[PDB]
Amino acid sequence: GIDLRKHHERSTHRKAPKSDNVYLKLLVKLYRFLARRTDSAFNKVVLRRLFMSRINRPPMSISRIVANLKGNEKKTVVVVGTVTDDNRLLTVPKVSVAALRFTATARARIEAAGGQAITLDQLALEKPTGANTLLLRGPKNAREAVKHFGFGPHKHKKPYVASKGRKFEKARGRRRSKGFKV
């Protein structure tokens, strides 16, 4: 016998997507080969993000793409996720965006501005190593569920209440006039 504190501990990170998307399987095969046969650390990160689930790949808007693309113009924006359209952005400059998905409104506006709306397999063609790329991630903690995580006294989190009003959680433990405050 040997004095060990853990046995057969598994890696905590995902090693293959749970999706049955046949096209996504082809994409992972391409980036398994690229990440193995190149010294590009960009390829490894893109391969890892292809495995991630849907809550770990939040959508990004064109406005957030535009916000980060200065003065990083002449670079290809790479988003392993969905690029959405922003109404609050009245004009869209000429951009090169490679993403897993484009909403119909976002793809039309990017292309109308004269830019490129390409997929990640197209990106691997002219940029097999992310030579001039901007890898961008959407807002992870912007989800509604995260507002509830870690709820407790003096935590300023969102409670599980089925209605908004002067009732249902406003009396005791919410103001000093009724007992105490939190």
List residues binding RNA (CB under 7 A).
1-2, 4-12, 16, 20, 25, 29, 33, 36-37, 148-150
7 binds another protein (CB under 8 A): no
Q: List the single partner that 10 binds among RNA, another protein, none, CB under 5 to 8 Å by kind.
A: RNA
Q: Which is nearer to RNA, 17 or 115 (CB)?
A: 17
Binding part of the chain for another protein, among 1-9, 12-20, 97-105, 108-116 by CB under 8 A, reads 1-9
Q: Which is nearer to RNA, 25 or 170 (CB)?
A: 25
- Phi–psi pair at 22, nearest 5 degrees: -65, -40
What distance in Å separates the CA atoms of residue 159 and residue 148, rounded to the nearest whole number? 6
What distance in Å separates the CA atoms of residue 48 and residue 50, rounded to the nearest whole number? 5
- CB within 8 A of 75, min separation 6: which ones? 69, 96, 132, 133, 134
3 binds another protein (CB under 8 A): yes
What distance in Å separates the CA atoms of residue 166 and residue 182, rounded to the nearest whole number? 17
